[PDB]
Every structure is written in structure tokens, then in C-alpha cells.
Write an enzyme that holds these catalytic residues in place. Structure first.
Site, PDB file in Angstrom:
ATOM      1  N   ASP A 165     -23.193  71.226  75.114  1.00 16.12           N
ATOM      2  CA  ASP A 165     -23.692  69.951  75.626  1.00 16.12           C
ATOM      3  C   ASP A 165     -22.635  69.207  76.435  1.00 16.12           C
ATOM      4  O   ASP A 165     -22.542  67.979  76.375  1.00 16.12           O
ATOM      5  CB  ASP A 165     -24.278  69.078  74.511  1.00 16.12           C
ATOM      6  CG  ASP A 165     -25.339  68.131  75.009  1.00 16.12           C
ATOM      7  OD1 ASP A 165     -25.870  68.341  76.131  1.00 16.12           O
ATOM      8  OD2 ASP A 165     -25.629  67.167  74.273  1.00 16.12           O
ATOM      9  N   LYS A 214     -21.183  67.161  79.165  1.00 13.68           N
ATOM     10  CA  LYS A 214     -21.659  66.234  80.181  1.00 13.68           C
ATOM     11  C   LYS A 214     -20.892  64.925  79.998  1.00 13.68           C
ATOM     12  O   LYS A 214     -20.349  64.675  78.919  1.00 13.68           O
ATOM     13  CB  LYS A 214     -23.170  66.004  80.057  1.00 13.68           C
ATOM     14  CG  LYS A 214     -23.627  65.489  78.707  1.00 13.68           C
ATOM     15  CD  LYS A 214     -25.132  65.360  78.669  1.00 13.68           C
ATOM     16  CE  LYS A 214     -25.621  64.865  77.344  1.00 13.68           C
ATOM     17  NZ  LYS A 214     -27.088  64.661  77.364  1.00 13.68           N
ATOM     18  N   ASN A 263     -21.060  62.554  76.840  1.00 12.92           N
ATOM     19  CA  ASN A 263     -20.549  62.994  75.556  1.00 12.92           C
ATOM     20  C   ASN A 263     -19.034  62.968  75.486  1.00 12.92           C
ATOM     21  O   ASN A 263     -18.474  63.420  74.490  1.00 12.92           O
ATOM     22  CB  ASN A 263     -21.054  64.405  75.231  1.00 12.92           C
ATOM     23  CG  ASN A 263     -22.495  64.418  74.812  1.00 12.92           C
ATOM     24  OD1 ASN A 263     -23.063  63.380  74.479  1.00 12.92           O
ATOM     25  ND2 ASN A 263     -23.096  65.601  74.799  1.00 12.92           N
ATOM     26  N   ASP A 273     -20.775  64.285  69.949  1.00 11.60           N
ATOM     27  CA  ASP A 273     -22.129  64.825  69.930  1.00 11.60           C
ATOM     28  C   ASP A 273     -22.095  66.340  69.881  1.00 11.60           C
ATOM     29  O   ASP A 273     -22.066  67.025  70.913  1.00 11.60           O
ATOM     30  CB  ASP A 273     -22.969  64.312  71.099  1.00 11.60           C
ATOM     31  CG  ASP A 273     -24.441  64.651  70.958  1.00 11.60           C
ATOM     32  OD1 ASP A 273     -24.832  65.428  70.064  1.00 11.60           O
ATOM     33  OD2 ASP A 273     -25.226  64.116  71.745  1.00 11.60           O
ATOM     34  N   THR A 289     -28.592  70.045  78.511  1.00  9.75           N
ATOM     35  CA  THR A 289     -29.087  69.038  79.418  1.00  9.75           C
ATOM     36  C   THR A 289     -29.334  69.701  80.771  1.00  9.75           C
ATOM     37  O   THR A 289     -28.475  70.462  81.234  1.00  9.75           O
ATOM     38  CB  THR A 289     -28.021  67.938  79.537  1.00  9.75           C
ATOM     39  OG1 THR A 289     -27.750  67.365  78.232  1.00  9.75           O
ATOM     40  CG2 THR A 289     -28.490  66.841  80.472  1.00  9.75           C
TER      41      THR A 289
END
Ligand SMILES: NC(=O)c1ccccc1
Ligand SMILES: NC(=O)c1ccccc1
Length: 340
Positions: free
Chosen positions: A156, A158, A161, A174, A191
Site C-alpha cells: 500500500d 502511497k 501512508n 497503515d 490503491t
């Protein structure tokens, strides 16, 4: 690799596995904390700023509604998140301080990082210079070297985060999609703008997806927008699989070259997934100015320090409706979350 690095990672794995095999459980309870403010929201939970009533310490408390986790088929992912987070230890990973559950919710209480999300700072300034983007990228490279050596995939990456701490360094938060994986895994998650082609195409994929996501992140940090963007996710996915990316003219040649090798659609040719592993990235000319040990030791002066007034300041986070946090008189989904 230098034996010093080999021995470091061997110890890191030993320490992770001891906690992985015997996870901590039930180390606080809700009425130990005061609720201060909602810091973020999602489809099955929220993150709150809280204060511990006896010590006065602030924490960020992630609250997940068990019934929504079940309905959204996130049971295994939430168990992964907590089991991994209680077992890891690295300078650029947020620390989990407590966890517990009650009749309705799962709770993960982690260190509060008042500087906010990289996403906010990136959008406020427009783009980061290459040195600034490289400072953050180097921390992600080291963090993935750590996680991957433990057989963990993050899944994840991005800007939302990546929190920026009081020293201007990243703490990745996260772990909702993080997973311990030997070989391949198959779940569609992440995502859209950051998904590697092999996730989109429903293949069995590996840690190479994290290196692809690093390419997306570096591009976004240095350009101000991600390389694959569109109104509909399917349109994003068509661009991702196409093998075509356009670079701004202000990108250095070294940056373009690194990005072509991270944003390599063929996972068997992607930097980070070759025989030399992470060293193809660490040795790339875009990182020639990076002192990897100094970054790890947090001895490099950061490009900027977020502005905040103290450990309870929420100015770097945004405003959300303050909704009730209810605990049922009856236990929900006890069996599903037994191990939490
Ligand atoms: N009611 C509480 O104790 C509470 C504490 C922290 C977060 C949400 C609720
Ligand atoms: N650890 C934190 O400060 C945090 C804040 C907001 C969202 C997630 C985590």
C-alpha cells in the site's frame, strides 16, 4: 553484500520471528484513553487522536468495526496488519504501542506523528525537488529491504501512508494490506494508481509489486502527480499495463533511467526483483549522493520539518465529522477475530 548488513538483517529476522510466533494481545483497554479528534476515516474504520489518561501521552488509535471488516472481506488482512505491526521494528515504521478488541471493534494504538501525511505536504508545495524526493525514497528503499527480508510485502505504498515526523523523516503507517508471503500471493488489493501490472492481471505476484509502487511514488514526488492517472480505474489500469510513461522535461536523466527500471512492466526485469535485489536500486546513479547508513541512523538533515506546536497538535491533519464510537452490549464476530 557486506557481512555487517547480512548480520543486521539476520538479527532483524530473528527478532521479528520471535514476536510473530508469540504475538502480544490485549495490552490496553478503551477507557484508558480520552478521545481528542478524528484524524482520518475509511469504509470500515477511523483513526483518532487519543490521550492516555494516566501518562498523558498522545497516540493515534486505529478503530476497525468488526462487522464491517467481515462484510468487506478484510478479516485476514486485519489479522495480518496487527500481527505484523506488533512484530516489526525499524526506524521508518510507526510503532504499535497497544492493541485490544471489544464487543464491536478492533483497536491498534500507535505512536502519533503530528507532522501529517506526505500527501498534504506534497500537494501544498506542488512537487519535491529531486534531492527532497531522494531523501524520502532512500527511506522507503531501506524499509522495503527490511520488510522483504522478513518475507513481508507491504502492498500500500502511497503518499497518504507516509507520515512526516518531528525530524522530517518518514514513518510508514497503515499495514492493512501487508502480508507475510513466501513465494507468491494473489489478492487484489492496494490503491489503483499504485498497482503493478501483475496485480491488475490477476497473476500470482511477489515483492516486485512494492518496487513498482516505489517507482510510482518517486515519480509522483518529483512531478507532483502520479504517472498513470484517469477518471475511471479501468482507464488507469489500461495505462499501467501499456508500458508507456511520459516524463516531465525537468526530470534528470538519472531519474528517468531509474524510473524506467522500477516501472518495468515485465516483473522479471524490474529493479528490486533481479539477482542483485535491492542493490540494483541502491547502486543506481540517481542514489549516488545517498549515504545509506547515515539515512538509517537519521543523521542526515531533513529537507523540511513540519510545522506543529506540540505532540497534541492536529493542524497537519484535516477535519472530519466527529461520529460516535459505540461498543455493543453483545459480542460481534468473536470467532473470526479470536487471534487478535
Ligand atoms: N470512550 C472512550 O473511552 C474513547 C477513547 C478513545 C477513542 C474513542 C473513545
Ligand atoms: N500514526 C499516526 O499518527 C496516524 C495518523 C493518522 C492516520 C494514521 C496514523
Amino acid at each position: 553484500e557486506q557481512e555487517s548488513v547480512k548480520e543486521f538483517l539476520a538479527k532483524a529476522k530473528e527478532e521479528f520471528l520471535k514476536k510473530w510466533e508469540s504475538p502480544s494481545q490485549n495490552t490496553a483497554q478503551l477507557d484508558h484513553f480520552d478521545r481528542i479528534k478524528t484524524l482520518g476515516t475509511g469504509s470500515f474504520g477511523r483513526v483518532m487522536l487519543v490521550k492516555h489518561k494516566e501518562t498523558g501521552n498522545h497516540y493515534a488509535m486505529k478503530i476497525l468495526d468488526k462487522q464491517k471488516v467481515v462484510k468487506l472481506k478484510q478479516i485476514e488482512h486485519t489479522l495480518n496488519e496487527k500481527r505484523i505491526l506488533q512484530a516489526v521494528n525499524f526506524p521508518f515504521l510507526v510503532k504499535l504501542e497497544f492493541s485490544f478488541k471489544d464487543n464491536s471493534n478492533l483497536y491498534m494504538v500507535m505512536e502519533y506523528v503530528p507532522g501529517g501525511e506526505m500527501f498534504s505536504h506534497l500537494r501544498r508545495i506542488g512537487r519535491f525537488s529531486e534531492p527532497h524526493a531522494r531523501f524520502y525514497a532512500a527511506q522507503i528503499v531501506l524499509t522495503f529491504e527490511y520488510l522483504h527480508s522478513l518475507d513481508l510485502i507491504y502492498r500500500d505504498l502511497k503518499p497518504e501512508n507516509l507520515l512526516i515526523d518531528q525530524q522530517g523523516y518518514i514513518q510508514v503507517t497503515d499495514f492493512g494490506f501487508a502480508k507475510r508471503v513466501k513465494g507468491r500471493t494473489w489478492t487484489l488489493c492496494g490503491t489503483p494508481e499504485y498497482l503493478a501490472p501483475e496485480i491488475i492481471l490477476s497473476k500470482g505476484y511477489n515483492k516486485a509489486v512494492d518496487w513498482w509502487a516505489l517507482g510510482v511514488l518517486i515519480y509522483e514526488m518529483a512531478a507532483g502527480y502520479p504517472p498513470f492517472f484517469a477518471d475511471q480505474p479501468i482507464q488507469i489500469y489500461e495505462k499501467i499495463v501499456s508500458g508507456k510513461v511520459r516524463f516531465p522535461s525537468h526530470f534528470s536523466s538519472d531519474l528517468k533511467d531509474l524510473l524506467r527500471n522500477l516501472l518495468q512492466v515485465d516483473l522479471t526485469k524490474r529493479f528490486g526483483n533481479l539477482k542483485n535485489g535491492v542493490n540494483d536500486i541502491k547502486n543506481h546513479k540517481w542514489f549516488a549522493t545517498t549515504d545509506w547508513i547515515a539515512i538509517y541512523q537519521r543523521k542526515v538533515e531533513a529537507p523540511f520539518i513540519p510545522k506543529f506546536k506540540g505532540p497534541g497538535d492536529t493542524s497537519n491533519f484535516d477535519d472530519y465529522e466527529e461520529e460516535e464510537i459505540r461498543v455493543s452490549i453483545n459480542e460481534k464476530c468473536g470467532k473470526e477475530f479470536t487471534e487478535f
